[PDB]
């Protein structure tokens, strides 16, 4: 007597002619579970920005003064719709390229390139505003310097910096836009100003734009910002007659690798894992998942289906 090795237990799989057949030893491949916290990745802890954007950390915000020195990291977490950003209204030219090239940098050492005590014929104190307050008092950024006249004068500026290291750099500067002529003749003295920046690959000249605008955050003026990368054995030059926001600190690239800039809102929790979706974490071995299409590390493939079971059975 011959026949089938009948059995029991209930589970259903999908076929091409029938839709809900019944099987015995089916096995599942889709994973639909996640712990729901931000975790570590092979030991190295992420960088968590609580209420602070990427531009507000690289320029230095008075209410973001805990990220002054930062250790190594794996990925960057940024909340949606931050609340600190740039206190003084304006813009940073080519922001998305900076948010694209920070995704391959894993460490930043900070270097003083022009000391704040090397301006004997200018003023670096009364350059504050009520838009960025520190503990209920006017203040400014902490990586740039705003230069105003002293003794009713503003001599021309010529400054150079020569790179004598084995790794690259990253320098930021800016320009100030006024709102009428009396303010310009008060903070600075010359009516017509310019800014010149030149290196072996860059050439740039700018002029201010005096006009009438509306109110944003209380003020009626704007400031712009730029950036570049200096290569070893090269120099950067400056020249200004007014409207200059001078650089004081710079960042040195010392490690490169793989990284990402997430957007999420979950809370931190001390654990360990080897994959990370922006709304949880994965610890499994099945080669498929369903949570989110952005990941980091090695993680199973992604699909949009709800069920995926291949049968190994009878009946």
């Amino acid at each position, epitope marked *: 007597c011959i026949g089938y090795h009948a059995n029991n237990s209930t589970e259903q799989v999908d076929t091409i002619m029938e839709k809900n057949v019944t099987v015995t030893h089916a096995q599942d491949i889709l994973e639909k579970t996640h712990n729901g916290k931000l975790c570590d990745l092979n030991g190295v802890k992420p960088l968590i920005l609580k209420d602070c954007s990427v531009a507000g950390w690289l320029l230095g915000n008075p209410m973001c003064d805990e990220f002054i020195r930062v250790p190594e990291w794996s990925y960057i977490v940024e909340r949606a719709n931050p609340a600190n950003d740039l206190c003084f209204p304006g813009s940073l030219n080519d922001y998305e390229e900076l948010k694209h090239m920070l995704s391959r940098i894993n460490h930043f050492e900070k270097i003083q390139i022009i000391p704040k005590s*090397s301006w*004997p014929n200018h003023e670096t*104190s009364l350059g504050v505003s009520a838009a960025c307050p520190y503990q209920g008092a006017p203040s400014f950024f902490r990586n740039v310097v705003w230069l105003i006249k002293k003794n009713d004068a503003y001599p021309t500026i010529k400054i150079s910096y020569n790179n004598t290291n084995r790794e690259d750099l990253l320098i930021l500067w800016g320009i100030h836009h006024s709102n009428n002529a009396e303010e310009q003749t008060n903070l600075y003295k010359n009516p017509i100003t310019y800014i010149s920046v030149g290196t072996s690959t860059l050439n740039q000249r700018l002029a201010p734009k005096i006009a009438t605008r509306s109110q944003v955050n209380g003020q009626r003026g704007r400031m712009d910002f730029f950036w570049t990368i200096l290569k070893p054995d090269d120099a950067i030059h400056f020249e200004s007659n007014g409207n200059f926001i001078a650089p004081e600190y710079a960042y040195k690239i010392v490690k490169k690798g793989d990284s990402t800039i997430m957007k999420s809102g979950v809370e931190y929790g001390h654990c360990n894992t080897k994959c990370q979706t922006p709304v949880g974490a994965i610890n499994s071995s099945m080669p498929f998942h369903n949570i989110h299409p952005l990941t980091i590390g090695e993680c199973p493939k992604y699909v949009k289906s709800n069920k995926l079971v291949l049968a190994t059975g009878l009946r």
Partner: antibody
Amino acid sequence: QVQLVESGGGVVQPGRSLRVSCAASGFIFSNYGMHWVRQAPGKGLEWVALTWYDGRNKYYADSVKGRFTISRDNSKNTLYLQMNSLRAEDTAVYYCARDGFPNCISATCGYAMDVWGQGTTVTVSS
Amino acid sequence: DTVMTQSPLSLPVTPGEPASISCRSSQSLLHSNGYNYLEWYLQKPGQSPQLLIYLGSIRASGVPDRLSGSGSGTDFTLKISRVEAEDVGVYYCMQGLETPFTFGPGTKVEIK
């Protein structure tokens, strides 16, 4: 104007502790670093401690390491120095001094000391 | 640690002619910016010190036009163009590159 006063000196026997103070009135106090300096009788000057503006990081010398402390305690415009394990060679005069430019966020900033105090004497005897 | 040597220990002068002092170190006090981290102070008898010079050659706010300083690497020098009776005290040399700040032996200027 700008001035600094100190008080708290006296006579102390070995093994005990002592507290010194330094009060300021003038410039805003929550935007500057502060220092302490000694001068033994007949000898030269020496350096002891340094604190930041907010108060996070602190630094001490090697003949002082792990034995004295420094704190700010803002909103009353004062500075403190707690001295434990007082030996015999620590007899000197003490001075306060602030930086010359605001908001130093590095260890060796490049700024110097501009305004100095007057001095208080501390002695170890008997 | 960095030792700081200063010579001469004593220096008698008379009004009218210039004078010079030196201060030496066992390490190169030159950063990558191109600036030297070295200072100069002064203490008149029975008083508190008073700062003279910032990083190398930048003067303070109050010092006359007679004091100047110039050097690089490991040798530094102060120069007084003309000497008066008020300029009598002790001059100290100080470094600021590494975290433990160190002074020097000092030097006296006695009229004669």
